[PDB]
Amino acid sequence: MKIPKRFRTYCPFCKTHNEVVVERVKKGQASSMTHIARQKKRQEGIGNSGKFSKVPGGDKPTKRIWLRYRCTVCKKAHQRPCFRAKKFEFKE
RNA sequence: CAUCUCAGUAGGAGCGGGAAAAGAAAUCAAUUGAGAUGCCGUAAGUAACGGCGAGUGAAACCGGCACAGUUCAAACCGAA
RNA sequence: GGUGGCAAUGGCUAACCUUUUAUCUGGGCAGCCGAAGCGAAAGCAACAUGUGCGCAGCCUUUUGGCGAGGCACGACGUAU
RNA sequence: UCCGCUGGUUCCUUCCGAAACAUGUCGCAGCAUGACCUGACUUGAGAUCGUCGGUGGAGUAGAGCACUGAUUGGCGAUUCCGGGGAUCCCUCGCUCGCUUGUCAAACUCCAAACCCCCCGUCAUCCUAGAAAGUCGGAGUCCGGACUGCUGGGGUAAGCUUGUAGUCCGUAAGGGAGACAACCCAGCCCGUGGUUAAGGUCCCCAAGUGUCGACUAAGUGUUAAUACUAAAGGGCGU
RNA sequence: UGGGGCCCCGAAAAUUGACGGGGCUCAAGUCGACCACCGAUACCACGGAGUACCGCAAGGUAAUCUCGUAGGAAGGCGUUG
RNA sequence: UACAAUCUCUGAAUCCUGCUCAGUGCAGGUACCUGAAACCCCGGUUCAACGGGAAGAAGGGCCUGUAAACAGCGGGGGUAGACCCUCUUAAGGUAGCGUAGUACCUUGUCGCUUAAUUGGCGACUUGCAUGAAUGGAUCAAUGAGAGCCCUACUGU
RNA sequence: UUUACUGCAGCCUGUCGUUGGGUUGUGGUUCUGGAUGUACAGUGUAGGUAGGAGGCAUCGAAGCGGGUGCGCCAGCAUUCGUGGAGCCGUCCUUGGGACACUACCCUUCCGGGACUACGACCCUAACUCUGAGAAGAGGACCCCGAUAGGUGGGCAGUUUGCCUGGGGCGGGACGCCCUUGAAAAGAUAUCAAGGGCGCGCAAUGGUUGACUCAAGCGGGUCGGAAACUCGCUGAAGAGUGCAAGAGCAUAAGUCAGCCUGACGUUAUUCAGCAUAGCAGUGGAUGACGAGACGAAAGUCGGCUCUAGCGAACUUUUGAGCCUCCUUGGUGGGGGCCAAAAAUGACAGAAAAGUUACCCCGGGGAUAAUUGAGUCGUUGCCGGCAAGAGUACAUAUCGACCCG
RNA sequence: GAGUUUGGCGGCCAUAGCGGUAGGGCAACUCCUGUACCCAUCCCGAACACAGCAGAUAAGCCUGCCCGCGUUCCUUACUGUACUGAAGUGUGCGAGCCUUCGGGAACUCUGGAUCGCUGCCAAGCUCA
Ligand SMILES: [Mg+2]
Ligand SMILES: [Mg+2]
Ligand SMILES: [Mg+2]
Ligand SMILES: [Mg+2]
Ligand SMILES: [Mg+2]
Ligand SMILES: [Mg+2]
Ligand SMILES: [Mg+2]
Ligand SMILES: [Mg+2]
Ligand SMILES: [Mg+2]
Ligand SMILES: [Mg+2]
Ligand SMILES: [Mg+2]
Ligand SMILES: [Mg+2]
Ligand SMILES: [Mg+2]
Ligand SMILES: [Mg+2]
Ligand SMILES: [Mg+2]
Ligand SMILES: [Mg+2]
Ligand SMILES: [Zn+2]
């Protein structure tokens, strides 16, 4: 499973066909100031705590490949529905 | 079913009267106003909370009943 | 749902007062629903009839005509 | 306290009258939504339970080997891919063609009778309101049986699981010895009359009826039916 | 020799006993036909009740209305105030 | 007040008590790795929230001891059933006992006990699935314990 | 009961308070004696840097010492002297820094004194134990209050599904796709039969052009009955990524050229889920905006058609906007639209056992076995007789098959 | 204005295909002659492209015929047979089957047919 580093595809902002650069979308780290974290602080007391003592869930046999297509003119990225592959070479 | 709900309920300890508790803004408002407290009506099953599930859940503005404001500490005198 | 009062100049009052003992008569516009919608929000803001088919009913040569309500369009407000 | 689990729930008549099924469910003794029942209202002209003819859909029964898999011998050769016992001395199965004998639920060159959509016609319903629409109230999701489908499974079963019609459930009255669902019949009350199913020696209403033969075993005197014995033999008749 | 109808052998179960029973032999059995009669709340006639729909009422139409469980709807009776 | 208290296993006497520290448990060591908050350092915030760094307690990893701690003591096929090999994921049953209160096959085979015994006792034993303080073997006296046999007695 | 899920006591340890006075090793905090500042040296020591230089000097300035701040035993300071001139640099040691007094505000130097935090030691007056008390023994440790991390069936609250020819065991007929069952429209069950899927591919994708594949027959060199080539027959007997079924010949197949439509946004209808409600999500027609190939017509919303997948809440990412309570700004939150992260019990609980010590409510809606149905099996017979019986099927025994 | 022949684009898609055989080219098609040019070969002017006079009906195309295989149709028998819709107090120990009214094959058999029908337009002609 390869895919070119660059190719020519419609840019939804420029509304024209021109080169794009493909890259990998890396999952960030959850911050501590969102309201879920504040709720987790407010709900920690004595004993059980509901959602925040849930065991972590399982996983699926193969995840999707999450990619971001960034234009080379306006530098504005856009995302597309992603396929599912095990080994993903990124064939420039 | 574990947070939640049942519910500050059932139950317990203390104190206490014909009533008790509260009570004279370090308040509520919004551009500018009101002027102690209690109780009833409404705001309203709204805002808000919540495995944002089941459920829980106000107040201010406004209309009434009844109306009431004051006393110490200190600065000055020093037993008056 | 069946039966009623009032009716866009809309409908109803709640607590309470007049109670002359719980009735009753007259007040009580706070407030709730209706009157403008769309949208998460900021915000913006529509036909007081333009056309056709046609039931009831009425007119008529008994065949056609007018045709409330009904149905189908057209036009417009807002969100995307 | 709570339960989807067990028992009970009090007067009369009148009009209409089901489902024991599909999907979701920590669902299988429960519930929701739909099908099916009932009441009211709006609208205002058609509807199709049935017949005949035509334009179309067939791929089941049956039939057959033209494809796919099997299958029986004879004949002629594969001068192979093959097993028997240095010119592979020569035997020769598998295989390819012509003829004979069988097959198929996942085969088809063929191909019905039922059945389905639509058009026309007849016929029935309909302004005393067709088709369609809106709102209120439910019950029900333990079913069973008979006649067909050589239904599927199973040695078979009053077994288990499907499907079309009609029934019991909720169906009186008449006849089957009695018989949930078998035959006649779908039922307001009273009187008279004629018939259906079935019967007519006595029990028991009506034939010791008619015509032509058979049986000698008390065989039989038993529509269907979960209730009725087979292969084989008989110079029995 | 072949094809048919009926019957016989093949054919043994436990309380006493099941063509419904008595019984039945040119039949009161089997096969093919036929005639007459009996026999329902079915069908016909008369009278009566109710219901559905229409009509101002009087009344009119009903071969095409009268079964019924779960259940829906309508009108009435009774007890105490 | 250690000839004590508390906590466990086994169960008089007699002959004895084998091998295994892989698993789990316990104790000690913590070289090294991991390991929260507070304090400290940097970035951030006209201040905070917040993000990294250093350091590093108990505990864990890692190492050592411990079986009268909880526990374990295996296959087959060569060879008069030996013994060289095995399968050895720590080791592969020592003394004893053995068809058992444990032996499925099973009413195992032989002897004593009866005319005749799925019985009792003795012997063998390839032990489905015996075994040493999960105590092994045997044992005089005792037993309202559980089996079998002899004698006397009797209406069982 | 436990190495089920979630917690709570008990115990072990860090930090804060109670909590004091000294010994010193720590590091800056904080403070002096010199700009200490100095390689291409120096007549000069970059008196940081620097008005790229002008005031000092027998009215104090030099070369030298162990060497005076310090460093290159050079030398700016005048210090203990020593000679009795280093002046600025427009002679810049023409500079890493090129240098002059009222500036050294600042490499630094660092009695590091100073409050602080750490590791160890000492003291008594807090505090603790003993005693009627004097007093004795410990001692800023321990106990105690708070907080953080561990161990923790000692104890508590719960979960441990369903289908099923009774339950269990086995399995998953618990989500999706094809053929038969299925009775020639549609629908149709069983732990019914045959099965498959939880993927792979920058080419194995799009378009245009040129062609025809499987297998045989005839010929050519050891190119052996195993190779490549020429001619003929060849509607498909091949290939089309993967199951089954269907489709395809001037092609939906094979090869070459050019490309990335494996595009952003949006509306209906169909099936999932006949008739007849039900997510998400897929597949067929379209619409707007951009393209590829081709003379054009046209084809292209991946790989010929039907499988290859998941709601709400939550976090993360992309474009642009809306918003936070009298007003304006900064940091930080909340919202709208799409994509990714998973619930396989697949229309979506954070989840193990035992009860013969058991308790309760129901069930013949569902089992031991009494009954009823069936007869595979079991007991008992029959038909044909193959053969044996010294000859002779039937004195006697009786095969195979059938009832 | 009717007909014939030739040429192009087609409808039904084997009654049209397979094989065999005898005839024709005047107008038309074809075969057929070469590679300057646009164009081409995974090599080849083979093909495609261009340029076109010669000769030929031996091939394509056209007309006539052949039952020799395959396909389509009719008739005789099989046969109102197999199968089947509706009703049945008809029948079998059983798996099953029978009567009435209504539908109705497949193969095989005797004998015949089928060697395509047809739409639009143009050109050469052939008439009044
Ligand atoms: Mg008192
Ligand atoms: Mg007060
Ligand atoms: Mg509360
Ligand atoms: Mg058949
Ligand atoms: Mg129910
Ligand atoms: Mg019936
Ligand atoms: Mg009925
Ligand atoms: Mg009856
Ligand atoms: Mg009722
Ligand atoms: Mg030992
Ligand atoms: Mg005995
Ligand atoms: Mg517990
Ligand atoms: Mg509870
Ligand atoms: Mg179960
Ligand atoms: Mg016990
Ligand atoms: Mg009980
Ligand atoms: Zn762009």
Tab-separated table of C-alpha atoms (C1' of nucleotides) in Angstrom, chain B residues 25-69:
chain	number	residue	atom	x	y	z
B	25	A	C1'	-26.950	46.023	52.839
B	26	A	C1'	-19.090	45.534	52.563
B	27	U	C1'	-27.294	43.979	48.968
B	28	C	C1'	-29.800	43.356	44.235
B	29	A	C1'	-29.414	45.638	39.543
B	30	A	C1'	-27.408	47.901	34.462
B	31	U	C1'	-25.966	51.588	31.351
B	32	U	C1'	-29.507	56.403	34.438
B	33	G	C1'	-32.533	52.385	39.227
B	34	A	C1'	-34.298	50.167	44.031
B	35	G	C1'	-33.928	50.687	49.387
B	36	A	C1'	-34.527	45.701	56.659
B	37	U	C1'	-36.940	40.823	57.492
B	38	G	C1'	-40.654	36.940	57.057
B	39	C	C1'	-44.931	34.510	54.392
B	40	C	C1'	-48.206	33.809	49.924
B	41	G	C1'	-48.560	34.214	44.028
B	42	U	C1'	-45.502	34.182	39.560
B	43	A	C1'	-40.998	33.644	37.093
B	44	A	C1'	-40.844	27.716	35.972
B	45	G	C1'	-40.287	22.273	35.278
B	46	U	C1'	-37.012	27.815	32.815
B	47	A	C1'	-31.426	28.685	33.795
B	48	A	C1'	-28.230	25.045	35.908
B	49	C	C1'	-26.541	19.668	37.163
B	50	G	C1'	-26.333	14.644	35.132
B	51	G	C1'	-23.382	6.741	32.878
B	52	C	C1'	-25.668	14.863	29.515
B	53	G	C1'	-29.121	8.476	30.872
B	54	A	C1'	-33.066	7.995	34.489
B	55	G	C1'	-33.885	11.990	36.990
B	56	U	C1'	-32.732	16.630	40.269
B	57	G	C1'	-33.737	21.842	40.067
B	58	A	C1'	-33.467	27.663	41.788
B	59	A	C1'	-33.166	33.023	42.487
B	60	A	C1'	-33.799	38.341	41.020
B	61	C	C1'	-37.452	41.642	38.605
B	62	C	C1'	-43.106	42.114	39.529
B	63	G	C1'	-48.270	41.688	42.688
B	64	G	C1'	-49.957	41.180	47.702
B	65	C	C1'	-50.370	40.443	53.796
B	66	A	C1'	-48.021	43.458	57.546
B	67	C	C1'	-44.877	47.651	58.571
B	68	A	C1'	-40.205	50.180	62.887
B	69	G	C1'	-36.023	51.269	63.739
